Amino acid sequence: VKIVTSQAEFDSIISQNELVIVDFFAEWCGPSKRIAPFYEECSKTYTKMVFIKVDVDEVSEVTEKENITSMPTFKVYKNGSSVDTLLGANDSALKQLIEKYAA
Amino acid sequence: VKIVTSQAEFDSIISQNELVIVDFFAEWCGPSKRIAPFYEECSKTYTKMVFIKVDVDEVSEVTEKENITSMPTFKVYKNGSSVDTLLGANDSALKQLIEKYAA
Amino acid sequence: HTYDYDYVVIGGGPGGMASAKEAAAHGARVLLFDYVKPSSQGTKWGIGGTCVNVGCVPKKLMHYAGHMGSIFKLDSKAYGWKFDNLKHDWKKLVTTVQSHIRSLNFSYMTGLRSSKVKYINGLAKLKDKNTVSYYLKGDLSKEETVTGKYILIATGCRPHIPDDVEGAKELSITSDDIFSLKKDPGKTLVVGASYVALECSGFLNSLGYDVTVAVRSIVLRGFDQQCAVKVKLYMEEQGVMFKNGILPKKLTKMDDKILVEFSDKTSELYDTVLYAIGRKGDIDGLNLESLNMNVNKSNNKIIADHLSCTNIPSIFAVGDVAENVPELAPVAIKAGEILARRLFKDSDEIMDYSYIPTSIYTPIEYGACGYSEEKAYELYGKSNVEVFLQEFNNLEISAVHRSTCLAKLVCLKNEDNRVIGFHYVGPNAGEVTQGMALALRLKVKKKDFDNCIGIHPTDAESFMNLFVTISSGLSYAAKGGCG
Amino acid sequence: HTYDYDYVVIGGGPGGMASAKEAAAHGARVLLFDYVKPSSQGTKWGIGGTCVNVGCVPKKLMHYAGHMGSIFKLDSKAYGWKFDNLKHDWKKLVTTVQSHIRSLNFSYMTGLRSSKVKYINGLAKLKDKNTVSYYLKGDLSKEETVTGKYILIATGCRPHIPDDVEGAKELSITSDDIFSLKKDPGKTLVVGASYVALECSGFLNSLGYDVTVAVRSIVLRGFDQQCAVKVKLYMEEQGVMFKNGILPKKLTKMDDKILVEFSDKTSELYDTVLYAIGRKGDIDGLNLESLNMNVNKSNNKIIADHLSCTNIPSIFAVGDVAENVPELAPVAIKAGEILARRLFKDSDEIMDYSYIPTSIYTPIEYGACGYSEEKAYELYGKSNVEVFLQEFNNLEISAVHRSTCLAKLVCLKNEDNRVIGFHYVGPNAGEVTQGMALALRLKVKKKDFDNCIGIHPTDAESFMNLFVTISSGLSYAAKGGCG
Ligand SMILES: Cc1cc2nc3c(=O)[nH]c(=O)nc-3n(C[C@H](O)[C@H](O)[C@H](O)COP(=O)(O)OP(=O)(O)OC[C@H]3O[C@@H](n4cnc5c(N)ncnc54)[C@H](O)[C@@H]3O)c2cc1C
């Protein structure tokens, strides 16, 4: 995948892109490293969406802006605007979300 | 050594004997099994004293009569009468007592 | 009128000894009998009663053994400790336990003779309202008699194995047997839903044994069910299986194992069956019918008033053997001591049975004092009771990633939220609850908890900032973490 | 009059956060700065303050690691657990500790934004009595300003390494460094006699390091000295060496080790030197002289009244940075919260600083609340103070044959032995003390302890039958055992 590392770079990819899904994760978080390999699989499978991970400790300002309160959090951005938000490490729950916009 | 196992047998050995030293010990007592081998050594060394062990749980009546309240307790009997009493597992303390009457 | 002794007590347990020692310090000539009738499996022990020999003491020691096991297995790796070939030795543990019990036997004995209480290792019973006939060493060869100005019955209780289950009595063990068991317990069925059952299941499982608990209905009757459930649940997570609503109907020995057939017609092989379904008053051999002393079944317990009087004016009962008195050692001890003073020191104290604190030593511990949530609703009405609570993570546990803990207060809205119920689930429950129990007896209010400064970090401080209420309907789940 | 914010607080520690969250829940526009100036060794951390990053939290976690070690080594064999190759991994422990601290950083942050407090990671200082100038990320390149109706200083403290000891600052570490130390501590000298010193010594030693403590004071100044000695003594039994009355005079790096020369001209090689001789107010960069705010040296602390007011009417101070306030997180939190209410909710509460409970996580723990024996004698006169006490053996410990415990109460004879001092040495001190602390605030008397029923078996129940007094001159030694 690709990991965002600044506020400028973050809004850039929500701007100059139509469908983008984001993984908000922490290095010290169990369930966010656990659902992390399964996330890499949908990266290739659903190319009708650009997959990105944001470290929550690292891009402090983005994490304050998206209202991230628990990891892992998944947010779907369409045309530059957040439309869906999923909290959890359920592989099943994530598959139902990415299919809602890509497939 | 020799272990006393009744009240009759106990007063018998304080009666028909002039110098007698007694070890009051318990099977569940740490320090009374610890000073116990060193006690066997003075048995042979100072034959001017008859060495005996009394189990405290076993001869309940003797233990009530000698005022045994802690193990190991050592009591010196001369001519049928208690004259000295030592409380402790100090090999050094015991050597100072048996020498006071035998050597 | 002349008697052999001023006070003769039957029972060398906590209640009997306390009542005897106390009466001797106020001038009395006291004689105390203690003899131990063998268990279903023919097990016996020294002086002291249930607590020291086959109760609180060896229970707490084995709990510590098992809690230790859980630390090695769940937390040690996270904390940097490495080791190989971890195993537990049942025989070694039993010797450590029994050896320390034997030391307590001794000190209890020398304690009696210091207090100037005459002790006889004899099986005792009632002749008449001032006469006790004893059998020395429990032999029926030589009967003796002694008279007393006052007689105290403190014979306690024994575990009850049911009559109407085939092979139970002949095959199962009880708490009288477990703390001295010569064999490894092996795969174990525990029947019963009492704290004894839960506690034994707890440590046997922490020790590393395949453990099943046959429970009917619900665990810890009388306790706060939210806590009772949290405890059960935690035990399930640690490995103890529960067969809910099923109990054994037949037990059969075969090949040094026990085949158990349950009510639901299923069947299972075990190495050991431990019955822990409740205890009964040990009065049968006391000849009480002859004085027409009123007793209760199926407690098999003596009816005593608030002053510990039976319907025979020279006879009294304290502790376990007495109907409706909490079966805790400190309770027997205080009642004993209070009776001894009313009798031989002209006291007018009355034993207070309210706000008695207690603590369960299950793999997650639970301490309590006062009313459960439900019983408070029942007696005061739901709308007049506020319940403050909070689930939270123990700091040391939550860093392992193996809610652990619950802090719950029960209050009376119409007495300025005065606290009438305290319940805590988490580590060191007994240590947390003691000071809290005292606070409840001082008629503490919820705002007093709020103005007390907390000790950080501790599980106990959770009671000092408790603000979610049940009727707020807000969440009291543990936050984090990650999250 | 118009301001950017109603409340601007400098310090994202317990005091500052609490004061900010509480003010926002009563309508205020709040902004909070937290920036972490690097340690002597260039160490830094996330949001939350001293407690979460470099205090209570990682302290308690490492204590548990060390207490665990003591269990394996001293008690496990007696309890039947066998294993081989027991070793401890310093790196592993640090990751577990730091990883859990990082999770607390996150929850504290999201906690701020939920409470509607604006957080800026910026180094802040005073411009004038209603203006704060901050440096974003601590860079001096871009200075900004913001105004506030009220300004709270809660900048806390930092460990102080002495100026007049050669090489100290350059070579030693402090508590800011120990919980994240990348190397094994190895052979370690700890300088100081505070609980931080004693606690760090304690766990490093339990972990398995050769540990020396250099003291030219008395251990635990202002705590009860009987307990202070019992704790020190226990630590000596466990292996920590104390150099009494000697301190380092020079420190020299040589071959990746530190040669320390002491006041007594002796010298010694160590792997790590940890200074823990006291903390000082972190005010130096705040530009307080410009408003002529009165401060105290050598605390380097802000003088604040009982209402947390400085001599500048728009400026306030809570927590560590304020003179004469106990340096405990729950204390900063409650003061913060009370100030926030007086300011933005018209409250007339006043922070109560009496009977603050505390607990020390030394290899034997010690919890206390209220007066020591000595200080009670000083302020009320010896003949008017009764001291009840008892040394005893913990049940789980005393069965190992490795007194462990002391229960002590301090009472006022002329107020019916109302309890003004509680001190307890033994396991789970923080858990035992919390409820007792509450009891002391309810003005509990010694007879209330006597009428409370005890929880058996627990260390805490010792307080419920405490009868030997210091002035009886009777023995309060632990009985037994065997004996
Ligand atoms: C497994 C277990 C764990 C427990 N744990 C705890 C705990 O952690 N904390 C707690 O507070 N409580 C605990 N208890 C309860 C506690 O042991 C009892 O509440 C307490 O023992 C009651 O004391 P007692 O004096 O009333 O009776 P007992 O302690 O039972 O004493 C009665 C004694 O009298 C003897 N006796 C009976 N009849 C006669 C006779 N005719 N002549 C001579 N002697 C006779 C018995 O041998 C017995 O020793 C536990 C109990 C069990 C079974």
Ligand SMILES: Cc1cc2nc3c(=O)[nH]c(=O)nc-3n(C[C@H](O)[C@H](O)[C@H](O)COP(=O)(O)OP(=O)(O)OC[C@H]3O[C@@H](n4cnc5c(N)ncnc54)[C@H](O)[C@@H]3O)c2cc1C
């Ligand atoms: C080793 C150790 C162990 C401890 N253990 C315990 C314990 O077990 N129990 C207990 O109750 N207490 C313990 N304490 C004490 C407790 O941590 C403190 O009392 C607590 O932190 C309260 O301090 P505070 O809220 O006033 O400010 P602090 O917690 O000290 O934090 C102040 C914050 O202000 C920041 N700051 C300073 N200047 C600026 C600026 N110009 N701009 C922006 N930010 C700034 C700091 O970086 C810091 O984050 C311990 C302390 C230590 C050192």
